[PDB]
Design a protein around this ligand. Structure first.
Ligand SMILES: *[C@@H]1O[C@H](CO)[C@@H](O[C@@H]2O[C@H](CO)[C@H](O)[C@H](O[C@]3(C(=O)O)C[C@H](O)[C@@H](NC(C)=O)[C@H]([C@H](O)[C@H](O)CO)O3)[C@H]2O)[C@H](O)[C@H]1NC(C)=O
Ligand SMILES: *[C@@H]1O[C@H](CO)[C@@H](O[C@@H]2O[C@H](CO)[C@H](O)[C@H](O)[C@H]2O)[C@H](O)[C@H]1NC(C)=O
Ligand SMILES: *[C@@H]1O[C@H](CO)[C@@H](O[C@@H]2O[C@H](CO)[C@H](O)[C@H](O)[C@H]2O)[C@H](O)[C@H]1NC(C)=O
Ligand SMILES: *[C@@H]1O[C@H](CO)[C@@H](O)[C@H](O)[C@H]1NC(C)=O
Ligand SMILES: [Ca+2]
Length: 292
């Protein structure tokens, strides 16, 4: 005879981690009345930690610790012998964009890919914006030039496809959604330089009986070793008329092979080889020796 009627309910605005109790109250209708709940048109999964209290003409959702997994549309269904009725509401809980875990200092290797990590929490999923202060001075943060080589990824991590020395510096990460904004602490990106031979004469001429010096300039992370070779034999110190010497000029190493005196047989290909933990390189110098 008298059908059930549910007292209209609407979920208030909630904060993450609060306690929630929401009753479905069947204020009229002949007994007995069966009251059940759905979430998003399905039974509430036991995984969700929602308690259901069925007390006479009521059924209540009880949640000890509100989390993002509780977001969704909840339906109360009240059925007796005469009729079944439904009432529904949307549970919305929003999370302010929070930096709980900051970005870490990282090493990038010149010429290779680096990802700068920046997961912040927030719902709605926050929009992520990166800033950059070139080099290790007092930071002055500027927008970043996105141009294929530098991209922001879906998870909000910064991709540098081919690191150059100019990428070395402070990076930070700003997050906003409707609820708020946050600005990460900066991290420092160090660009590691594989050993490079940057400069040498391609071909050079000596005179029999005279001193000849040939130099190579190397760059890269220290320690860096420069060795010389003549037609795949290593020029060892014990070699009588050859002297290898090194000097530091700024961040560069200048290696000099001195021959004293030069003989006709010194002519041919010399190589200077630089190695550090990150890489190696070589230069080739053709020596010709003219007559006295
Ligand atoms: C005579 O020797 C010179 C060196 O004294 C040779 O020059 C080299 O020529 C190369 C191609 O022919 C490259 O152009 C190289 O220049 C760069 C490069 O490889 O692009 C410039 C880059 O900016 C530099 N990268 C840095 C500094 O980070 C890169 C780097 O130093 C390499 O590791 C060098 O080993 O060099 C240029 O130096 C001439 O080709 C040679 N000529 C002849 C006739 O033999
Ligand atoms: C829960 O109910 C919402 C409506 O009250 C629903 O949101 C609407 O869905 C529309 C697409 O069908 C569009 O997204 C509108 O912008 C939005 O208001 C929401 O999608 C439902 N949530 C579920 C099923 O999880
Ligand atoms: C953010 O997004 C990146 C997804 O591309 C992820 O990194 C990748 O991991 C891949 C695994 O093989 C491979 O290493 C790619 O080179 C690298 O791009 C990155 O770790 C994600 N960040 C977090 C915090 O999860
Ligand atoms: C970046 O995130 C990935 C994926 O979880 C992680 O494994 C990697 O080592 C991170 N790098 C950091 C935090 O320096
Ligand atoms: Ca329905």
């Amino acid at each position: 005879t008298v059908p059930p009627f549910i007292q209209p309910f609407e979920f208030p605005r909630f904060s993450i981690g609060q306690r929630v109790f929401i009753p479905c109250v069947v204020v009229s209708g002949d007994l007995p009345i069966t009251i059940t709940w759905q979430k998003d048109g399905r039974p509430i999964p036991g995984s969700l930690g929602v308690t259901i209290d069925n007390i006479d003409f009521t059924s209540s959702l009880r949640i000890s610790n509100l989390s993002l997994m509780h977001n969704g549309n909840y339906t109360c269904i009240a059925r007796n012998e005469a009729a079944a009725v439904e009432h529904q509401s949307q549970l919305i809980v929003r999370v302010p964009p929070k930096f709980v875990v900051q970005p870490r200092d990282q090493d990038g290797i010149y010429g290779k890919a680096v990802i700068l990590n920046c997961s912040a929490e927030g719902y709605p999923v926050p929009t992520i914006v990166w800033k950059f202060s070139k080099g290790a001075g007092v930071p002055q943060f500027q927008p970043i030039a996105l141009n294929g080589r530098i991209q922001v990824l879906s998870n909000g991590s910064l991709l540098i496809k081919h690191v150059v020395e100019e990428d070395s510096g402070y990076y930070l990460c700003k997050v906003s959604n409707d609820v708020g904004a946050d600005v990460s602490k900066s991290m420092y990106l160090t660009v590691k330089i594989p050993a490079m031979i940057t400069s040498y004469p391609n071909t050079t001429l000596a005179t029999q009986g005279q001193k000849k010096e040939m130099s190579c300039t190397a760059h890269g992370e220290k320690p860096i070793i420069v060795r010389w070779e003549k037609e795949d034999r290593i020029i060892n110190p014990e070699m009588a008329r050859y002297l290898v010497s090194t000097k530091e000029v700024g961040e560069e190493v200048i290696s000099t092979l001195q021959i004293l005196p030069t003989v006709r047989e010194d002519s041919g290909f010399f190589s200077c080889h630089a190695i550090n933990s990150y890489g190696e390189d070589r230069g080739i110098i053709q020596l010709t020796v003219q007559e006295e």
